[PDB]
Enzyme design. Structure first.
Site, PDB file in Angstrom:
ATOM      1  N   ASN A  91     -78.812  33.799 -72.655  1.00 18.49           N
ATOM      2  CA  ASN A  91     -78.937  32.451 -72.150  1.00 18.49           C
ATOM      3  C   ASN A  91     -79.679  32.430 -70.804  1.00 18.49           C
ATOM      4  OD1 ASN A  91     -76.392  33.724 -71.266  1.00 18.49           O
ATOM      5  ND2 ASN A  91     -76.000  31.794 -70.201  1.00 18.49           N
ATOM      6  N   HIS A  92     -79.537  33.471 -69.987  1.00 20.26           N
ATOM      7  CA  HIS A  92     -80.252  33.494 -68.706  1.00 20.26           C
ATOM      8  C   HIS A  92     -81.743  33.859 -68.737  1.00 20.26           C
ATOM      9  CE1 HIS A  92     -77.020  32.316 -65.991  1.00 20.26           C
ATOM     10  NE2 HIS A  92     -76.222  32.971 -66.812  1.00 20.26           N
ATOM     11  N   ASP A  95     -83.619  30.662 -67.565  1.00 19.84           N
ATOM     12  CA  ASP A  95     -83.455  30.138 -66.216  1.00 19.84           C
ATOM     13  C   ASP A  95     -84.845  29.868 -65.653  1.00 19.84           C
ATOM     14  OD1 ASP A  95     -80.722  30.316 -66.298  1.00 19.84           O
ATOM     15  OD2 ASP A  95     -80.600  32.137 -65.094  1.00 19.84           O
ATOM     16  N   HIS A 187     -76.205  37.697 -78.215  1.00 19.29           N
ATOM     17  CA  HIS A 187     -75.776  37.308 -76.878  1.00 19.29           C
ATOM     18  C   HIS A 187     -74.876  36.074 -77.083  1.00 19.29           C
ATOM     19  CE1 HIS A 187     -76.046  37.590 -72.609  1.00 19.29           C
ATOM     20  NE2 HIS A 187     -75.816  36.288 -72.647  1.00 19.29           N
ATOM     21  N   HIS A 222     -72.927  38.557 -73.058  1.00 13.34           N
ATOM     22  CA  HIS A 222     -72.632  37.204 -72.613  1.00 13.34           C
ATOM     23  C   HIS A 222     -71.264  36.999 -71.999  1.00 13.34           C
ATOM     24  CE1 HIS A 222     -73.174  32.985 -72.118  1.00 13.34           C
ATOM     25  NE2 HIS A 222     -72.251  32.656 -73.002  1.00 13.34           N
ATOM     26  N   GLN A 224     -69.473  39.374 -71.144  1.00 11.41           N
ATOM     27  CA  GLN A 224     -69.447  40.451 -70.159  1.00 11.41           C
ATOM     28  C   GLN A 224     -68.141  41.197 -69.991  1.00 11.41           C
ATOM     29  OE1 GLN A 224     -72.727  37.938 -67.622  1.00 11.41           O
ATOM     30  NE2 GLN A 224     -71.450  39.408 -66.496  1.00 11.41           N
ATOM     31  N   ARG A 339     -65.574  32.678 -38.353  1.00  8.19           N
ATOM     32  CA  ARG A 339     -64.270  32.841 -38.996  1.00  8.19           C
ATOM     33  C   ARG A 339     -63.104  32.303 -38.211  1.00  8.19           C
ATOM     34  NH1 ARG A 339     -63.070  37.674 -41.132  1.00  8.19           N
ATOM     35  NH2 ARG A 339     -60.848  37.816 -40.516  1.00  8.19           N
ATOM     36  N   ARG A 343     -61.370  29.266 -41.090  1.00  5.51           N
ATOM     37  CA  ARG A 343     -60.052  29.620 -41.617  1.00  5.51           C
ATOM     38  C   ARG A 343     -58.966  28.775 -40.969  1.00  5.51           C
ATOM     39  NH1 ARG A 343     -59.995  35.964 -43.000  1.00  5.51           N
ATOM     40  NH2 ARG A 343     -62.251  36.161 -43.388  1.00  5.51           N
TER      41      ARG A 343
END
Ligand SMILES: [Zn+2]
Ligand SMILES: [Zn+2]
Ligand SMILES: [Zn+2]
Ligand SMILES: [Zn+2]
Length: 506
Positions: A91-92, A95, A187, A222, A224, A339, A343
């Protein structure tokens, strides 16, 4: 074939390469090591008088900046040197504009297969549906099939149903070429016991719908996953590299998958005699994977990196690395990613990042933990390198379609995470006072779409798992790439638009 003779065939496979032509930080995987491994097995198998076939389940495209910025050119040139025989289109590979795919097809020394992708106007296939390989006396055919969920560039492009195209094709082959063996490189994804949920049916339903053993094996991708069975119709949950791996087998058809990124080279050894195709061994071979024990130690003996491969790819690695310095846009103010601040409170970096995630996924709202923002972007020109410092971990963008009731339970859970921790939540399109999505009140019986990162989706920082639920889809798009695309699409940026106006509170 000579009657009553045992022919030996080894099938090697990988899938969902996703731009990982180079080893990672910890010196894991990469194509140079994969080439040493594969040349090794060929040398071995040839000495015994057997045959080797190397197949790919697709998704070579998308996943690493250095590859993406070069339309995965080093990846296909690398595969050529490793020696791939065929590849299923993933599918990629869609892209990029179809002209880029045609181009990758010019670079690939091996065929890119997919029998179910049609051009609406004409009504003809856009790619080769199969490829024939002659190994000794055997005629082996490899069929390619692509998930029809890909349509999520598709003008005049139709993805017909894989399982049904597989039947037609298996017939054309038998009336025409009459292969001794037929392998499908697909895939589509492996879902335990065919429970594909909201996803389009995958390898398991296809195998159960085809006539018994009409396919020697299905080399997949796909989803994975390293397909190692724990029980009947159940893959192991945290497969440990270096340990025994039992492929799935449905309706007499073997189903395999090697996880992702060049992490494992799967190996299936068969013996063919009098038409019987028999798997006499299988194993998922780790490519310099290391475990964190702190230290990171190899699970198996180190595999050296082929130098000819290093020579080939090193120019591409430097070229892509340099191209990260290129400007992608500009901002009129500071995007706050310190950070000590992401956070504790909502910041404009949080809003921007989630704005980009909802944009790529079509989400109604979004959330992520603050510890995921790793740096700030000062005012001025922005380079791809600046975004990678903010989103350096390569997490993947996912989303979940859920009901009003469900969003209430989820957010309530997430609103519990406390400040002064990396699990502190950054929100987008959500406003509240702890003790509405996009302004309007939450209709309980309405379906809303939430975007986030796979990390939090699977439980990271203790967030509620969306992972195992209907309506969940992992897009395979990487965090930094989604931010980068949104930014250049939105430049010049005005941090005003991203300032949180106190919408969620405690
Ligand atoms: Zn993939
Ligand atoms: Zn895929
Ligand atoms: Zn992994
Ligand atoms: Zn600070």
């Amino acid at each position: 074939y000579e009657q009553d003779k045992t022919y030996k065939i080894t099938v090697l496979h990988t899938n969902d390469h996703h731009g990982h032509f180079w080893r990672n930080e910890y010196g894991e995987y990469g194509l140079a090591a994969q080439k040493t491994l594969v040349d090794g097995i060929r040398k071995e198998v040839a000495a015994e008088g057997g045959s080797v076939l190397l197949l790919s389940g697709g998704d070579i495209n998308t996943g690493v900046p250095e590859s993406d910025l070069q339309d995965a050119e080093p990846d296909f040139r690398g595969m050529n040197l490793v020696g791939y025989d065929a590849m299923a289109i993933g599918n990629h590979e869609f892209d990029n504009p179809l002209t880029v795919l045609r181009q990758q097809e010019k670079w690939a020394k091996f065929p890119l297969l997919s029998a179910n992708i049609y051009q609406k106007s004409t009504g003809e296939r856009l790619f080769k549906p199969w490829a024939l390989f002659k190994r000794q006396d055997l005629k082996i055919a490899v069929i390619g099939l692509t998930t029809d969920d890909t349509a999520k560039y598709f003008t005049d492009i139709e993805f017909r149903k894989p399982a049904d195209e597989a039947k037609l094709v298996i017939q054309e082959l038998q009336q025409t070429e009459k292969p001794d063996i037929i392998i499908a490189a697909t895939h589509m994804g492996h879902y335990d016991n065919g429970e594909h949920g909201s996803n389009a049916p995958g390898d398991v339903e296809m195998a159960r719908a085809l006539p018994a053993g009409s396919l020697a094996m299905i080399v997949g991708g796909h989803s994975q996953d390293p397909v190692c069975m724990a029980a009947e119709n159940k893959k192991q949950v945290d497969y440990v590299p270096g340990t025994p791996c039992k492929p799935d087998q449905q309706n007499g058809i073997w189903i395999v998958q090697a996880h992702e990124w060049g992490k494992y080279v799967g190996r299936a050894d068969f013996e063919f005699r009098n038409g019987e195709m028999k798997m006499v061994n299988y194993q998922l071979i780790p490519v310099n994977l290391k475990k964190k024990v702190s230290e990171r130690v190899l699970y198996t003996p180190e595999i050296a990196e082929n130098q000819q491969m290093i020579s080939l790819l090193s120019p591409f690695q430097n070229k892509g690395k340099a191209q990260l310095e290129v400007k992608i846009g500009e901002t009129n103010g500071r995007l706050e990613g310190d950070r000590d601040k992401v956070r504790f409170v909502q910041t404009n970096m949080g809003r921007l990042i989630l704005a980009a995630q909802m944009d790529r996924t079509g989400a109604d709202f979004a959330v992520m933990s603050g510890g995921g923002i790793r740096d700030s972007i000062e005012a001025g020109d922005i380079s791809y390198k600046n975004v990678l410092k903010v989103q350096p971990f390569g997490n993947v963008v996912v989303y979940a379609d859920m009901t009003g009731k469900e969003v209430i339970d989820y957010l309530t859970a997430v609103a519990q995470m406390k400040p002064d921790s990396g699990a502190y939540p950054q929100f987008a399109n959500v406003s509240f006072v702890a003790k509405k999505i996009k302004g309007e009140p939450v209709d309980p019986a309405k379906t809303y779409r939430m975007a986030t990162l796979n990390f939090n989706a699977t439980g990271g920082d203790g967030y509620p798992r969306l992972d195992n639920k209907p309506g969940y889809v992992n897009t395979g798009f990487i965090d930094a790439e989604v931010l980068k695309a949104y930014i250049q699409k939105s430049s010049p940026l005005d941090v005003s638009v991203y300032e949180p106006k106190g919408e969620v509170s405690w």
